[PDB]
Amino acid sequence: ADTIVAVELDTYPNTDIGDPSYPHIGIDIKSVRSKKTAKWNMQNGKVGTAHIIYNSVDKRLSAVVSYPNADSATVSYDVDLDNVLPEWVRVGLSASTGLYKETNTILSWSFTSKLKSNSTHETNALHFMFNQFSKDQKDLILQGDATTGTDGNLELTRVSSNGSPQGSSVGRALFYAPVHIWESSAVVASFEATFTFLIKSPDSHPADGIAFFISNIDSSIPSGSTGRLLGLFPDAN
Amino acid sequence: ADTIVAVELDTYPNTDIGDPSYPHIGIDIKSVRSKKTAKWNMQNGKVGTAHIIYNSVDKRLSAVVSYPNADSATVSYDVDLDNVLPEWVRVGLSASTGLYKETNTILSWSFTSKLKSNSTHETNALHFMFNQFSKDQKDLILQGDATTGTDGNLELTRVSSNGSPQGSSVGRALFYAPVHIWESSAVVASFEATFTFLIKSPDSHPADGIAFFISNIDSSIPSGSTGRLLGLFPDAN
Amino acid sequence: ADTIVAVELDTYPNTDIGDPSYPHIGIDIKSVRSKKTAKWNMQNGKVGTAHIIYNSVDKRLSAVVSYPNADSATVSYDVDLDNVLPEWVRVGLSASTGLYKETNTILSWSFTSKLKSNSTHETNALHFMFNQFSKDQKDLILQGDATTGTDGNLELTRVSSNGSPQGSSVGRALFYAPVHIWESSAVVASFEATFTFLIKSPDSHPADGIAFFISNIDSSIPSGSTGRLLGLFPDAN
Amino acid sequence: ADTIVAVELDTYPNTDIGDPSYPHIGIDIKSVRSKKTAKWNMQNGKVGTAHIIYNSVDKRLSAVVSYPNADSATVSYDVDLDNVLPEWVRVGLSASTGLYKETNTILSWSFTSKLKSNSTHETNALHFMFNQFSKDQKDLILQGDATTGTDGNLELTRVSSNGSPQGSSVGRALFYAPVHIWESSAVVASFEATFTFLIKSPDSHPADGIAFFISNIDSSIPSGSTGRLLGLFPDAN
Ligand SMILES: [Ca+2]
Ligand SMILES: [Ca+2]
Ligand SMILES: [Ca+2]
Ligand SMILES: [Ca+2]
């Protein structure tokens, strides 16, 4: 049903569905079994920053995740998104918890998309930047358990009043306007997404992760995509 | 019903509803009878550029319209938009023709909105730029007779196959995402809009004009707003 | 000699040269005696943010200074900068200490200047953003006691090893490239500057302040401009 | 002496120094003998647009050159610029003519450089856009025969009063501020450059080409770099 391209910050190793034995960042092209992963030294309670970049000339989706004072983790995958996605897509953030949990807090999110045509000076562009989320964020489509406004942050999954993360939670936030990522006259199409997050768990084993994703405009959370499926995929195939 | 704040490029003088006896640019705050106008030496068949700027500290909405090789026309009006508009609005372009006509072609449109909060480094921003419009422009809400794709332009009003403008036409195009123009913690809110247009008429008297407007998110063309009402207002009060 | 237009964050009231009896923000047009001031509830040890905006259509230079969780202070002054400054200027930050002192630390600085011409799609722009300063910042001209790199910050005035601010210090940092703020064909010229600062003093009376300024490209610190003259003016006239 | 990384739009095939037998675009890393080339169907008298992109995660310098209504030509090369260039560089445009000639007119030039650090929200950026060049362009360093102001364009090489291109001409224009392309704490460094050009020759064989280049900050035209050496290299090694 949905077409999903995502960059996951997977906190919990589900080795039975192909995760490596550690937190990792991965690039998912229509399956939760990442096409490429990289070890991520996830820091519980620390604010991290993820940068995702791509352009149609190189056809390489790359992501860099870093924590202050720490070395970054980066993952890249050669993929032509014109062959995977529709030309009009929606971009968003997704997160889930299952039996194990963590807060999936987003403190800021910026995205820039550019479609440059072969006509001189013809660039179409979309850019949004959120450094504060209000309770009435009308330009975001919140799905599942995602809420905004709490300390001006976006909480992708359920957090009880006392700051505790809840299990079996799934939430997604998508920018309201469709994003144009391909057009017949485009000579170069590119996008850049950056978001800072705070994954905090009272447990030694947080789960399940946050994912930046791009999908068909009408994408909705697949039934049963809590836990390991990151609110992105209906099954683990 | 709708709350409209608009900057009009009025090509036809309807002196009975307060227009001056010449093409003029004006600032309309909830009425077609401009609060302030300035003579506009409209050039039939030439591509013009309109720049609209505003910020919540100065509370002055200003517009500058120019043609290559010609002197600009500028109009400014002191108005606090927080007292007029809702905090979530939609921005768009509107145009009409009545008994007299003209093409109301938009060749490019860019808009930048910024809400800076009192938290260090906390700027929320939205920016879109269209230098080419495709037939399937999913991020625009087209109302009335407005169409996109024709020579990669946005035609706000009806143009027949042979390039002739049609009379009694009204069309509007609004950016799909709501725009946040005020928030309790904002120290400065500002927006900038620029659009290039081509008004061409086979007649000595073109009508009726193009208007950049900001309105409540669910705004729709008022019944009978063709001609002098610019597809913006239901009557001439 | 130098032509200076500055927005000062004056921490010390020198009532004999016209300062009000409190910390204030003011707009200085070629004199340290501000043309307009506003009370500033300066917060020692807290990071503040100053926003300065101006455009040639309105001819109003406005500044907003805020601290997290506190109400902002704003000052505006109607001034046509084309009548004061050359068309090519340098922009910078200046600060001083005299008998009383404070640290004049800059944590980030961004500036955007735009000159839009009457030719369709003809915008000239310059934008720089510094959120981290390195020891070898080659695109900044550091004058006086200003240094960069220390905790990735820009220290406008002398701070000894143990973090103590030094008295009788003056330092300025200017962006290396000249900025074009006027041109014969420009229909609208505008600039926006934002910088976050940390003024900390061990004393109950910090002095003297930080100022965002615009000057002739070859501007240098006037002899004896420590203390009340903010490293900007040669005397108090 | 100088370290040059350039993307050339070579109009004249000098097969003896390795050029293919046609106009081509190539990526030059410290030698005029391109590391990679692509056939370019150069259109005499037409305005073209070149887009150059690069980021430190992928380490791929790519360029796309297009003409309205024509298919683009693109060339990419895997190169880690941190291993070639200094961390502070100057970016510019260069052009030459030899026995054969052409006008090397630049109508617009924009460049964006970004250095994102591992500290949350820490992006340093530089962006400039020139859509009109004036006679007194103080933020450009013009070398050789390059001049600005003529029809608001930048003429890299000599053009006589009657619009005729002159032979044995070499000119370069560099942005005044140094550009920071690497820093120890940077997690991702990227740049994007776009420029539109008009190469027009009265002859069937125009020469020699235009090149976008990045070099050590103090770069100057090598002696004898007219013609095939593009005002970039001292010899053909
Ligand atoms: Ca997992
Ligand atoms: Ca009218
Ligand atoms: Ca003072
Ligand atoms: Ca050659």
XYZ file of C-alpha atoms in Angstrom, chain C residues 130-220:
91
model
C 28.057 32.127 12.230
C 26.921 29.784 14.963
C 30.468 28.834 15.875
C 33.641 30.932 15.583
C 37.001 29.240 15.084
C 40.459 30.690 15.983
C 41.215 31.158 12.281
C 38.012 32.970 11.217
C 39.366 34.504 7.969
C 36.108 36.057 6.889
C 35.988 38.362 9.920
C 38.182 41.427 10.411
C 38.904 41.509 14.175
C 39.885 44.870 15.597
C 41.149 45.878 19.023
C 40.765 43.190 21.660
C 38.283 40.989 19.848
C 39.253 37.319 19.589
C 37.544 34.191 18.213
C 37.849 30.467 18.966
C 37.511 30.631 22.783
C 34.696 28.001 23.392
C 33.826 28.654 19.655
C 32.650 32.131 20.626
C 33.653 35.575 19.652
C 34.881 37.647 22.615
C 34.664 41.272 21.655
C 36.600 42.468 24.709
C 39.372 41.076 26.876
C 38.563 38.211 29.187
C 41.455 36.819 31.270
C 42.087 33.027 31.486
C 39.850 32.600 34.532
C 36.840 34.034 32.661
C 37.112 37.482 34.212
C 36.235 40.488 31.997
C 38.853 43.159 31.777
C 38.321 46.881 31.986
C 39.345 49.499 29.398
C 38.886 47.043 26.573
C 37.458 47.678 23.111
C 37.049 45.174 20.279
C 35.126 44.943 17.014
C 34.530 42.151 14.477
C 33.418 43.078 10.894
C 32.345 40.716 8.115
C 35.111 40.685 5.509
C 33.073 41.370 2.344
C 31.640 44.859 1.725
C 27.863 44.911 1.773
C 25.969 46.733 -0.971
C 23.061 48.604 0.644
C 21.952 50.901 -2.251
C 22.149 50.926 -5.997
C 20.474 53.217 -8.593
C 18.253 50.506 -9.980
C 17.145 49.085 -6.603
C 13.436 49.160 -5.910
C 13.836 47.714 -2.363
C 16.933 47.203 -0.264
C 16.634 45.457 3.106
C 18.810 43.816 5.739
C 18.169 41.697 8.797
C 20.813 40.996 11.485
C 20.518 38.700 14.458
C 23.142 37.923 17.075
C 22.995 36.175 20.442
C 25.162 37.549 23.218
C 26.181 36.766 26.805
C 27.010 39.810 28.952
C 28.258 38.659 32.307
C 29.840 40.843 34.959
C 31.035 39.979 38.485
C 29.922 43.507 39.403
C 26.581 45.033 40.178
C 27.262 47.675 37.511
C 28.389 46.193 34.162
C 29.643 48.454 31.422
C 29.673 49.356 28.641
C 27.686 47.512 26.047
C 27.591 45.790 22.719
C 26.594 47.471 19.475
C 25.680 46.118 16.062
C 26.986 48.741 13.604
C 27.200 49.559 9.912
C 29.984 51.799 8.721
C 32.172 52.924 5.852
C 34.215 49.878 4.709
C 37.501 51.138 6.084
C 36.191 51.900 9.592
C 38.622 51.309 12.475
